């Protein structure tokens, strides 16, 4: 019984090959991100310069957090919240923007705050409070092996791949979002910034759509 070293060496070789593929894919994703951001910036610049206005495409991904307790909730909004996986206060989920999802959010707007997330806050959320759902259990994600095992059928095998699927909605965004447990955030470190949370954002509260302002609140709560 001396083959333990042979299996050890084979495991190391396989791990090194896997790490090489992961590094190549991560470099490709970073290059794509930089290219896309620069392309949008220059497109806005040329539209401004050519006597025109650049109408940005509507954001396809939003982050929704629950800012209301589980008491005094009407049954239809309560059911919508359960279907959207918001059963604890200060719980957040990612949502792909469609007509059905927009009408769903319009119903439980009074009890949630949602807005367009950014790559930095998405990465921070996934790194810090990123938890998976394996065998109906909340197993923390501290290695790419678990992610590859539970998501390799969809072409996702690393935490960076999962973050990429979250930020850019693709063919397997539904499964990528379903694999992730809803993020249990804490109260904001710097406070909510308003005297009354249960008022609309235009009316001076946390209730309602915050658009790009959701990033600051999410990072404060995370």
């Amino acid at each position: 019984a001396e083959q333990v070293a042979a299996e050890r060496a084979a495991r190391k070789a396989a791990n090194k090959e896997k790490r090489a593929i992961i590094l190549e894919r991560n470099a490709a994703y970073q290059k794509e991100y930089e290219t896309a951001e620069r392309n949008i910036i220059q497109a806005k610049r040329d539209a401004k310069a050519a006597g025109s206005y650049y109408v940005e495409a509507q954001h396809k991904l939003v982050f929704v957090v629950r800012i209301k307790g589980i008491n005094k909730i009407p049954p239809k909004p309560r059911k919508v919240l359960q279907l959207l996986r918001l059963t604890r206060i200060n719980s957040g989920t990612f949502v792909k923007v469609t007509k059905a999802t927009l009408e769903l959010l319009k119903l439980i707007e009074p009890y949630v705050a949602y807005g367009y997330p950014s790559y930095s806050t998405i990465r921070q959320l996934v790194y810090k409070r990123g938890f998976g759902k394996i065998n109906k259990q909340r197993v923390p994600l501290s290695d790419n092996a678990i992610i590859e095992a539970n998501l390799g059928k969809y072409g996702i095998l690393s935490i960076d791949d999962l973050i990429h699927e979250i930020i850019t909605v693709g063919p397997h965004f539904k499964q990528a979002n379903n694999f992730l447990w809803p993020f249990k955030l804490s109260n904001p470190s710097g406070g909510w910034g308003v005297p009354r949370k249960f008022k609309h954002f235009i009316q001076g509260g946390s209730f309602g759509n915050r658009e790009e302002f959701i990033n600051k609140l999410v990072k404060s709560m995370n």
């Binding site: 220059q42 401004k48 006597g51």
Partner: protein, 51 residues
């Protein structure tokens, strides 16, 4: 047995993202953009301050 947080433990960050070493080496977090310059059209310039 215990969850260690990325972005605070360099070993765990490097284990999760092998590209982190290359990112730190190339300083991709602070990259200077191309020094291109375009001038807005007179129509937009006047519409900005048209009262």
């Amino acid at each position: 047995v215990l969850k260690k947080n990325p972005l605070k433990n360099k070993q765990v960050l490097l284990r999760l993202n092998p590209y982190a070493k290359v990112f730190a080496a190339e300083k991709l977090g602070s990259k200077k953009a191309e020094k291109t310059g375009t001038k807005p059209a007179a129509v937009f310039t006047e519409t900005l301050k048209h009262d």
